[PDB]
């Protein structure tokens, strides 16, 4: 993003945390600006010896090395909850066939079997059953409940 995030004289709008009392946990967000106590003397929000501001700017100039040039980053995390899957791929759906050996895909849950009208009593929230072998034994059709 050198074309966008760099300017003649240096873009310093982008910051990074330089000091912290401990490492971050996964997907932890720390936005605090508390003065970092590097030494034994409490800072009491006053900068000085062993009392530093936790953040620092990036030097983004168009002339900077590719290593020092700005890069825009997007991280996609994919999440399967105790809930229906609402984010699906563009993969088109098809008609449903019963009482035949088929290669089925329900919401990415793939398998091969014979799909039959069940007499199970799923709760309003329950999406798919399992067998003792931790294999899918029954499903709820995403299009038809």
């Amino acid at each position: 993003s050198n074309n966008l995030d760099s300017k003649v004289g240096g873009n310093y709008n982008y910051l990074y945390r330089l000091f912290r009392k401990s490492n971050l946990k996964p997907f932890e967000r720390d936005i605090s600006t508390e003065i970092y106590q590097a030494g034994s003397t409490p800072c009491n929000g006053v900068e000085g010896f062993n009392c530093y501001f936790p953040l620092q700017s990036y030097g983004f100039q168009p002339t900077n090395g590719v290593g020092y040039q700005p890069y825009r980053v997007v991280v996609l995390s994919f999440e399967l909850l105790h809930a229906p899957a609402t984010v699906c791929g563009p993969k088109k759906s098809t008609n449903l066939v019963k009482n035949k050996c088929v290669n089925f895909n329900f919401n990415g849950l793939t398998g091969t079997g014979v799909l039959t009208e069940s007499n199970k009593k799923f709760l309003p929230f329950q999406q798919f059953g399992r067998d003792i072998a931790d294999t899918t034994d029954a499903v709820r059709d995403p299009q038809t409940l």
Partner: nanobody, 127 residues
Framework: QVQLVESGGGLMQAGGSLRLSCAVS????????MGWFRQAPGKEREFVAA????????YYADSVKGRFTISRDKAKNTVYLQMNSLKYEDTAVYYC????????????????????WGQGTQVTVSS
């Protein structure tokens, strides 16, 4: 579209006081800093004082430490230089600066090239 405009310069006798003001329009210096510099005629620009906008921590040149005070009012987007115990040798053009850079270490603002400056206001000390 940002502007620094100084006021408060003038003639004082040695031992007296002056307050400079620099009004900022266009932007804030949130996590970064504002400064005061001076230039005496035919002498090189000199760092005077810097203040971090967020926390209000100050850094001073040795030549002014304990005599000058830098302060800032966020609501008015103004920085102030309180010039106490004025000496012949404080005579200079004083200009405020903005730094867009947030440096972790306050002392860096003594040497860091500023991106914004105002016009300057003349301070003259009588002896």
């Amino acid at each position: 579209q940002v502007q620094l405009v100084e006021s408060g310069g003038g003639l004082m006798q040695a031992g007296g006081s002056l307050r400079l003001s620099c009004a900022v329009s266009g932007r804030t210096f949130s996590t970064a800093a504002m400064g005061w510099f001076r230039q005496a005629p035919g002498k090189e620009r000199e760092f005077v004082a810097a203040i971090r906008w967020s926390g209000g921590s100050a850094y001073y040149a040795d030549s002014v430490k304990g005599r000058f005070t830098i302060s800032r009012d966020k609501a008015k987007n103004t920085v102030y230089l309180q010039m106490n115990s004025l000496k012949y040798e404080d005579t200079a053009v004083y200009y405020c600066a903005g730094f867009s850079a947030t440096r972790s270490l306050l002392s860096d603002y003594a040497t860091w090239p500023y991106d914004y400056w105002g016009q300057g206001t003349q301070v003259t000390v009588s002896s």
